């Protein structure tokens, strides 16, 4: 989206209730700088944060470093956004989005893209169906879960069946 300006009233939004796909933001040709301070970018997209903060502003070719340590000088301490202990990325392209990552009391919403392998039945496997975890053979079931129930539990609290989260079919786990 076009037009951008101002750093001191630099505009800022919570990013929340969405899956934060940072994957696309490497692969485009046009980014010239992408960094992280503290943790790797593919290592970012498997954490799970309450509030992803983003903000943007237009700049001149020669750019002063956006502040990792509390960087030192002129506009880089007299106009903005000076996070000494910044566990926060810095993007740029041919114009920057400086990212602060909140981990506050709230239930973490803006969470990794959760990349998903492809179902294999009738053999043995370690499975992770939506955070439910454990080894077994998944086979086609005849059980009829109600629309909102995600996993069947046996009499003695052992998981007996699951709903596959992408095709909403019920698999027994023997």
């Amino acid at each position: 989206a076009t037009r951008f300006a101002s750093v001191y009233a630099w505009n800022r939004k919570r990013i929340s209730n969405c899956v934060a796909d940072y994957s696309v933001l490497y692969n485009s040709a046009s980014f010239s700088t992408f960094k992280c301070y503290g943790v790797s970018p593919t290592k970012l997209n498997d954490l799970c944060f309450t509030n992803v903060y983003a903000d943007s502003f237009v700049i001149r070719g020669d750019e002063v470093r956006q502040i990792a340590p509390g960087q030192t000088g002129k506009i880089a301490d007299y106009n903005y956004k000076l996070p000494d202990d910044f566990t926060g990325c810095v993007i740029a392209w041919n114009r920057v989005v400086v990212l602060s990552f909140e981990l506050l009391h709230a239930p973490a919403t803006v969470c990794g893209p959760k990349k998903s392998t492809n179902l294999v039945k009738n053999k043995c496997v370690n499975f992770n169906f939506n955070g439910l975890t454990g080894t077994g053979v998944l086979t086609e079931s005849n059980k009829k879960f109600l629309p909102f129930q995600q996993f069947g539990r046996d009499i003695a609290d052992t998981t007996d069946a699951v709903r596959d989260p992408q095709t909403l079919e019920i698999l027994d786990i023997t």
Partner: antibody
Amino acid sequence: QVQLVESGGGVVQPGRSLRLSCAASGFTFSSYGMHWVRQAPGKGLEWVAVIWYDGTNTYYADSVKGRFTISRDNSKNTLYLQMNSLRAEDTAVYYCARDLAYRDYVWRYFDLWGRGTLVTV
Amino acid sequence: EIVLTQSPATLSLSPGERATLSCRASQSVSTYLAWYQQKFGQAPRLLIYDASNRATGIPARFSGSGSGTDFTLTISSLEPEDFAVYYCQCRSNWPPGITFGQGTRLEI
């Protein structure tokens, strides 16, 4: 003495496997990203693999997708590269290279080249 | 995908004269597309990025022009410090790899 020296040039039949290594020295191995670019005889440079400075994510060119393995062990400050299912085109001068940018994930330029090790099949 | 198309196949000239290579990009490549100078056996070194921006270590004699699908390099006065082979290079988004050209040889 900021140089890389390659290692592991040799000959193998098609369908078998090979492993190369590149030694880095004079600079911080675990602070820069690394590439392997291969120069087939009489032809131009063709990127093979890259790694960001902490080896936490890796990309391969299409011609080698799912057939070669790039890895860094900072214990010895040694870069590796395994091979599987090598074919006739794979003959080349494998130049391990070092990335241009300090701690930037763009992975865009090659600022430093190894002398290149022959591999033939 | 981006395929760089390089002309002429070769250049033959005396040193001191004006050397012009052309690289016709397939489709606009935004603000960075590179030129590589490789002497025989040596390690290739960038000369120009952005197609007019003078990279560091580069004497002023090397000049480039273009945007979109016209990209051309000029050298005003050749000396043996420059007499090598030359490539035009870029990176990609559709899937994440890199395209060089085929190369353009220079002759005396």
